[PDB]
C-alpha cells in the first residue's frame, strides 16, 4: 500500500497536502496528516496571512472549522474564477487538507521536506513529494481513525 | 503495437 | 525536471492523463502526450460515449476542439454541481489532457501501463502512475515545441 504526500511551499506557515493525486482526505484524516507533520489545520487568520504573500492553490482543503480554497489570480476552473480565501458551502465529500507549522518561518519556506517527521511503526509505503518533485520513502502509518483505514 |  | 504522467483507466478507448499533480499542460502538449501514448485529442462523441460507461474526473482538460470536464454525480467542487461531459467557456490556462487510443476494448481498461510507448529518446525521467498507483519509470522526451520545454 502506497501514500504519497505532496506538499507545497509554506507561505507563514501554511501549506497544502495532496494525498494520491486526488481528493481523497477526510477531516479526521486531515487533522492525523498535520499531527505527522508536526503542524496543525490552520485557523482562518493564519490562512489570509498565507494568501497575503502569495499563497494560492486550484484545490479546496481542509482547515480549522471550513474547507477552502486560497485564491489570488482569478482562473475559471479554481472557485469559479473567485479570489481571496473562498469558503466551500457543500462541503461534504473528501477533500485536501492545508497545514500550518508553528516552526516555519514568516515568509515564503522552499526548504525541502525529507521525511513525514511525526508518523509512528506502520507497514505502508509513504513517499513525501516536494514542489521540485523529489521524493523521499519511508515505511509507517499516521491515521488514528479506524473508519479512515476501512 | 498501438496500445496506451 | 522529472515528468510524472498519472493516468485513468481507460473507458471505450478514453483516458485523462494529469502531469505533476497539477494543472501544467498547454495545447500543443496534450497533442504531444496523446501522441506518446499512441492516441490522439478525443472527440465529443468519444466523451460522451466514456461519460455513458462510468467516466468522470474532478479535473478539466483537452479534448479535440473544447476544454471539458466529465461529470456523472454533482460535486460542487467539479464544475459547480454540473452533469454531462462540460465545456469550459474561458479556457486559455493550463489543463490537464484526455486521449482516445482506437485500440483499447469497448468497456473498461485498467491493464498497467508500463511505459510511455511512442516516445522518442531524451534526458527526462519520465514515470507512469497508474490508477492502481504503481509506478514504471524511463528516460526519454516526448515534447515537441520548444515554447513547452522552455517557457
Do not use: W
Not at chain 1, 485557523?43 to 494568501?51: D, F, G, N, S, V
Not at chain 1, 474547507?67 to 457543500?90: F, K, M, W
Amino acid at each position: 500500500a502506497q501514500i504519497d504526500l505532496n506538499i507545497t511551499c509554506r507561505f507563514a506557515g501554511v501549506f497544502h497536502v495532496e494525498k494520491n493525486g486526488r481528493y481523497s482526505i477526510s477531516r479526521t484524516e486531515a487533522a492525523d496528516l498535520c499531527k505527522a507533520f508536526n503542524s496543525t489545520l490552520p485557523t482562518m487568520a493564519q490562512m489570509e496571512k498565507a494568501l497575503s504573500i502569495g499563497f494560492e492553490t486550484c484545490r479546496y482543503g481542509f482547515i480549522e472549522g471550513h474547507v477552502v480554497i486560497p485564491r489570488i489570480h482569478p482562473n475559471s476552473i479554481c472557485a469559479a474564477n473567485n479570489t481571496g480565501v473562498y469558503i466551500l458551502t457543500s462541503n461534504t465529500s473528501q477533500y485536501d487538507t492545508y497545514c500550518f507549522n508553528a516552526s516555519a518561518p514568516p515568509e515564503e519556506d522552499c526548504t525541502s521536506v525529507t521525511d513525514l517527521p511525526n508518523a509512528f511503526d506502520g507497514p505502508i509505503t509513504i513517499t513525501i513529494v516536494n514542489r521540485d518533485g523529489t521524493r523521499y520513502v519511508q515505511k509507517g502509518e499516521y491515521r488514528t481513525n479506524p473508519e479512515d483505514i476501512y | 503495437a498501438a496500445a496506451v
